[PDB]
């Protein structure tokens with residue numbers, strides 16, 4: 169269960185955070201949670 | 212507020228950003244990448260667990276990422292550790308909701324979410340860090356979780372209802388976000 173719990177979290181965390189951003193008012197859709205993410209290279 | 216720039220409402224950040232619009236886009240992007248590096252961890256959960264999530268999310272922008280509120284807003288700062296300890300101790304006494312059926316888990320998670328929300332440990336970013344913790348809480352209990360189950364307007368009203376002690380709107384939120392067993 170532990171290894172499956174970590175596997176489930178890794179599968180869903182990126183989509184869940186995009187949804188969590190939407191709850192805070194950020195203009196983020198479901199497709200944004202599925203997109204590739206850029207690397208950390210803050211401008 | 213001391214967390215903000217002098218004569219402004221924008222919080223001081225590591226990138227020296229001074230208007231609120233460009234800081235949200237920087238915060239949204241940089242914290243999203245960080246959210247993709249948070250792994251599920253087993254209980255016991257705690258305030259320090261919550262702080263660890265907040266630090267991972269916002270350490271690229273705020274020095275106080277992971278640190279607790281120093282000013283008031285809610286539970287005042289000097290009582291936040293006591294109040295969070297009460298909540299997490301009660302959650303631990305209930306085996307972190309493991310063994311509970313779906314119907315029971317929904318009512319307990321809804322009440323636990325509002326209780327922790329009243330603590331409000333951080334100057335900013337409380338909701339996002341809290342929901343990642345509740346993601347781990349629900350899948351440790353053994354159930355799927357997706358915040359796409361509700362929209363923003365429903366989420367705001369459920370939290371307002373919870374401020375006034377009415378939890379039924381918070382319960383149907385988790386009724387719609389908690390799914391099948393893993």
Ligand SMILES: [Mg+2]
Pocket residue numbers: 328338370
């Ligand atoms: Mg909230």
